[PDB]
């Protein structure tokens, strides 16, 4: 919480007038992890392990959110946090009760220490932040995203091969997490999972 | 689940008799299938497959 | 892929083929409710078979 | 069975230390160091802290009778350390920080592969048979050169305060100045300062 505190309060001299919740922050990203590291054990799954390095990446990706973001508001600050969280912790997790469990866990960490008023659904998919369509970094709107999605890929096709494929919320989804991971200065990905389902293409 | 469903069907629907000419049937056998009905299938899937 | 992809890739699928219409698909959508996908047509009907 | 005694090995490796550092140092100083060590570091107390180290919760396990390189050589380096301090004291001034210095030894060749409490448990003991005119040991004092020559201050905590620009929170080089890494910092450094292997666990 100590050492956290600073990274925040560092990554905080970009928005000045918000360095009063560096502490909750801080105290919410180890609150979460533990948490974290407790409910989800290596005995149901032998990759969920949890090192502090989660939470290390974790303000990285914060400050990079920020570093090219536009003008944030406290609401908007809650919700890229609630991203970075989304996309350090919980992609690992398999599950569909274990997603909702971690749903619950960042509703509980985010009442329990940043209690403001305009956040809404933190759905993994009602919560696309993206830099594609837009020069800077933003929440976007999905239905934008697949208009897009949808002519781009139309381009690819007809430029490169004949392969049909039908765009899918899925789709559109795990499309910003590559993207997430492919715009890292070191950024390696690893897509598990079955067959007959995208990955290559 | 057809029935299930508003799907109706022919109730004396066969597969063979559905998907298969009468002389494709006898041209497999000339080139020598066995006239088992499992073989038939089977030949007409793989010869009706595209792609 | 879980059920509603399946249902949104399959409905996308279906939509350009022609459907004739047939007279008895409607009362039977009153009868099961097994809650499946929105109760609809022929294009549901056939998405939920599958 | 073991070849040797314990106090045997003991006073072969004292006796292989002096064969490098007495030819460097001047013989007034030599025999009296050599002689303040040899008596000091040879009591029986410290056999029946061997005794109280067996039932201790060592990570890899490595046999008391292979432990003492580890006690020796730490000590002698630090002890010949401050040759160039020592000169000037006091015998009692000069007896209480080479005590101090073998105690230290003691711990964290014996307890360094224990989990924090076990260390902080074992200070009593080591204060307890110690004699107790012979200066105390606590886990957070250090020995910094104040002020002039001699003037050793056991102190603790002198955290500097890091300024962090916020771009730094992603130079990988970075770390946070917290008093656990500082003295790991120092101990792993007087470990290679004494040309010893280390095992990172
Ligand atoms: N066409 C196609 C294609 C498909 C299907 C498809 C899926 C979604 C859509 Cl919208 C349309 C079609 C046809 C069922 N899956 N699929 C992949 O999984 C690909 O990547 C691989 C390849 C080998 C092993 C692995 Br594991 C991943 C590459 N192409 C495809």
């Given at each position: 919480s100590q050492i956290y505190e600073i990274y925040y309060k560092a990554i905080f001299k970009l928005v000045?007038?918000?360095?009063?919740?560096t502490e909750p922050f801080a105290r919410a990203s180890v609150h979460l992890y533990n948490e974290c590291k407790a409910r989800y054990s290596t005995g149901l799954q032998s990759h969920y392990l949890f090192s502090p390095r989660e939470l290390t990446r974790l303000v990285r990706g914060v400050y990079t959110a920020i570093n090219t973001g536009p003008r944030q508001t406290l609401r908007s600050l809650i919700r890229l946090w609630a991203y970075e969280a989304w996309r350090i912790f919980?992609?690992?997790?398999?599950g569909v009760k274990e997603k909702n469990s971690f749903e619950q866990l960042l509703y509980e960490t985010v009442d329990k220490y940043l209690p403001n008023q305009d956040l809404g659904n933190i759905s993994s998919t009602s919560?696309?932040?993206?830099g594609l369509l837009s020069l800077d970094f933003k929440e976007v709107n999905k239905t934008d995203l697949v208009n897009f999605i949808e002519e781009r890929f139309k381009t690819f096709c007809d430029e490169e091969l004949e392969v049909p494929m039908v765009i899918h919320e899925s789709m559109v989804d795990h499309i910003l997490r590559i993207d997430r991971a492919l715009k890292q200065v070191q950024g390696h990905m690893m897509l598990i999972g079955a067959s007959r389902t995208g990955k290559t293409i | 689940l057809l029935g299930k469903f508003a799907?109706?069907?022919?109730?004396?629907?066969r597969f063979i008799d559905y998907l298969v000419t009468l002389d494709e049937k006898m041209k497999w056998l000339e080139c020598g299938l066995d006239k088992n009905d499992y073989f038939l299938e089977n030949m007409s899937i793989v010869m009706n497959s595209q792609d | 892929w879980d059920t509603k992809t399946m249902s949104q890739v399959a409905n996308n699928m279906v939509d350009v083929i022609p459907m004739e219409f047939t007279?008895?698909?409607?009362?039977?959508?009153?009868?099961?409710?097994?809650?499946?996908?929105?109760?609809?047509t022929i294009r549901d009907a056939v998405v939920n078979i599958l | 069975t073991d070849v040797c005694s314990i106090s045997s090995k003991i006073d072969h490796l004292l006796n292989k230390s002096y064969e490098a550092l007495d030819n460097k140092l001047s013989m007034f100083e030599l025999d009296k160091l050599k002689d303040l060590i040899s008596d000091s570091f040879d009591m029986a107390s410290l056999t029946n802290i061997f005794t109280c180290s067996n039932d201790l919760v060592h990570i890899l396990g490595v046999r008391t009778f292979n432990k003492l390189e580890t006690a020796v050589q730490l000590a002698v380096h630090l002890i010949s350390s401050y040759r160039q301090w020592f000169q000037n004291l006091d015998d009692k001034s000069l007896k209480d920080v080479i005590t101090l210095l073998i105690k230290r030894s003691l711990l964290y060749a014996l307890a360094?592969?224990?989990?924090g409490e076990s260390q902080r448990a074992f200070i009593q003991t080591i204060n307890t048979y110690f004699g107790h005119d012979s200066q105390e040991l606590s886990d957070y004092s250090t020995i910094v050169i104040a002020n002039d020559k001699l003037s050793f201050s056991s102190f603790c905590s002198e955290i500097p305060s890091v300024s962090l620009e916020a771009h730094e929170v992603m130079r990988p080089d970075i770390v946070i100045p917290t008093i656990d890494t500082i003295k790991h910092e120092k101990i792993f450094y007087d470990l290679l300062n004494s040309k010893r292997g280390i095992i990172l666990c």
């Open positions: 000045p007038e918000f360095r009063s919740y919980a992609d690992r997790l398999v919560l696309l932040f993206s | 799907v109706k069907y022919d109730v004396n629907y | 007279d008895f698909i409607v009362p039977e959508v009153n009868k099961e409710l097994v809650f499946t996908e929105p109760i609809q | 360094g592969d224990s989990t």
